[PDB]
Design a protein around this ligand. Structure first.
Ligand SMILES: CCCCCCCCCCC(=O)O
Length: 133
């Protein structure tokens, strides 16, 4: 069900990421570096367990999870959140909850590109990833 998401992906477009980061309270110097960074995202499975790596010259993260099972996560901007990832309409939907706040990280495949939509508050960011061979 998740298999078309698997592989190595590189950032090739970003819209409103500064808005999203600012909404989360990320400081200006971090936003400045992140606005110029192009991460590589690696999505792998082993049975029921997905691992999602995000690599860059600035921040690195890695999470492992089972779809539909809550997990603790510490985000790239150091939020300690309760997370769940599911498939919904063919999209990989990652919901993070902390302190009564929520953010969603929604991934969908359009014409072979991975579109990541990040929503927090009113901020909506769209980042496009292309597959590496
Ligand atoms: C410290 C920089 C901001 C991190 C905000 C939360 C994670 C964003 C992930 C974006 C992406 O995977 O393209």
């Amino acid at each position: 069900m998740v298999d078309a998401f698997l592989g190595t992906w590189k950032l090739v477009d970003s819209k409103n990421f500064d808005d999203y980061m600012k909404s989360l309270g990320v400081g200006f110097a971090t936003r400045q570096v992140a606005s110029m960074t192009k991460p590589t995202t690696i999505i792998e499975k082993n049975g029921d367990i997905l691992t999602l790596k995000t690599h860059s010259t600035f921040k690195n993260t890695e999470i492992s999870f089972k779809l539909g099972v809550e997990f603790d996560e510490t985000t790239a901007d150091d939020r300690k959140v309760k997370s769940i990832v599911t498939l919904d309409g063919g999209k990989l939907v990652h919901l993070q909850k902390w302190d009564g706040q929520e953010t969603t990280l929604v991934r969908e495949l359009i014409d072979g590109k991975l579109i990541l939509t990040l929503t927090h508050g009113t901020a909506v960011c769209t980042r496009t990833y292309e597959k590496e061979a």
